[PDB]
């Protein structure tokens, strides 16, 4: 897969919405703009803030919360299979390992590293964008290199 989940909390017309189990073709139907255009706006805003574009923050569904969160879970299993292999010693694979997969495999010990390698594992990378009440934006990963690579 490519995207495991998208979660929006307290933004536009979304109270707490989680979308997952994405298939190869996703057909969106229903009454017009009851959240279709809102979901599109959420995704576009997240991907505009990913590339450090200065875009206006989204509105809150209810002002009785201080923040609104958009969480994207990327499925990086295939990229881990791409880079962890010995053959591909290229610069791009090396950079991808140093950025996305390090600082998560460093903490592990030998036994857990072996268990992760040998098992039919699935690897995920979760990135959360939080909008505070005063228009500030906070990421759950503070490295801009990670955001640009994603």
């Amino acid at each position: 897969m490519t995207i495991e989940s998208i979660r929006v909390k307290n933004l536009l017309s979304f109270d707490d919405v989680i979308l997952r189990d994405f298939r190869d073709i996703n057909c969106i139907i229903g009454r017009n703009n009851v959240g279709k255009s809102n979901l599109l706006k959420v995704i576009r805003y997240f991907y505009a803030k990913l590339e450090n574009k200065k875009v206006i923050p989204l509105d809150f569904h209810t002002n009785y919360n201080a923040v609104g969160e958009i969480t994207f879970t990327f499925d990086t299993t295939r990229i881990k299979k791409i880079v962890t292999s010995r053959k591909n010693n290229g610069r791009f694979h090396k950079h991808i390992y140093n950025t996305l997969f390090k600082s998560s495999s460093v903490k592990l010990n030998f036994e857990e590293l072996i268990a992760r390698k040998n098992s039919t594992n699935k690897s995920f990378f979760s990135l959360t964008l939080t909008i505070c009440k005063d228009d500030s934006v906070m990421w759950s990963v503070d490295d801009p290199k990670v955001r640009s690579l994603l």
Binding site: S5, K9, N10, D16, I18, R20, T62, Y64, N65, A66, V67, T71, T73, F74, L100, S103, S104, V106, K107, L108, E112, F124, F125, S126, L127, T128, T130, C132, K133, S136, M138, S140, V141, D142, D143, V146
Partner: protein
Amino acid sequence: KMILVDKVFYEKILSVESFKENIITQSAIPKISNKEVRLISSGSKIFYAINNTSPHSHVQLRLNRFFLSHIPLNSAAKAFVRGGSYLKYLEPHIYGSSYCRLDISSFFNNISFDDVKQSLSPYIKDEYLIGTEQKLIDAILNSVGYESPIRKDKGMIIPMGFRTSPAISNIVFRKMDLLIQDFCAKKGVIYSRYADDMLFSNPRESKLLMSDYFIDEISSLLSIMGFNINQSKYISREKEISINGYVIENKGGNGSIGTIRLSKSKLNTVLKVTHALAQNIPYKNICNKYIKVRLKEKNIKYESKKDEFEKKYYRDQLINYLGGYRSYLISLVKFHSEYKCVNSDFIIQINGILNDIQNHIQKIKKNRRL
């Protein structure tokens, strides 16, 4: 549209018949007297129970049903709210790498009635209910409030065990929910609250939740409305926390998703009960030894039959317990299936335990007919 209860709303929908005489005779609705309130003692805690026959119980229940349920709340409050649960209270912290857990000392006893009046005032019309003697808001507070005879110094007190105490606590604490949520979010910390128990998690790599500064700041925020932090229950840990049995673990760093499982302490009682049922030790011993449920002789409804009555009651208690624990574990399973945050090996163990419980329940229901 914001809810607004006025005189007609109280007369028709809320009072109905409970306070018809007091509203037609223009006599002030009185305080909940000590005669209507019984005082149970549970350990060091004291619980206040109102009699159902009193009109105060009816008006309180209808107040919960129609008025308190419509006032908006904060999303960090996961307790006593429509759709909230403990698992929902633990879920947002799977993304965190360090965990901190704080408690509020005597949450319900420290809720000042003045704060309750200030919180409920905008949602209640500023009218006179009875002539020019008693206000509508004061009558509703009479419905919700109480004076503890044990402690007359505080006067008005919101007691535990009433109909309306939890929701009123949530509404009055929405202010601190907002303040603490704003502070934690500006610090990058995920915050959630269940009753008086606050859980914070830092997903980044930092010692913020371990420093005394964080505790000092949360105490400073709580001091605005007069609350205090219970320092005996303050917990801070890295990469895993065992909160009252529920274990959250997240070893990874950037972009890692933790797992929520149950420690062996939680599973201890149910595993022992299943083993005892497999051991064919009688139902009376199973109920008494592990579940602490028993049929007191003074509680026998009828003297027509005793031994068969006790056998049926113990069988009912066992079937109820097994159904309840099965329901709890499927609550966990559904939470996993909808959020995908529970440990996979723990999921397998849960499935095995569930199959054992269902086999035992089938055996019990089959032996019922023999």
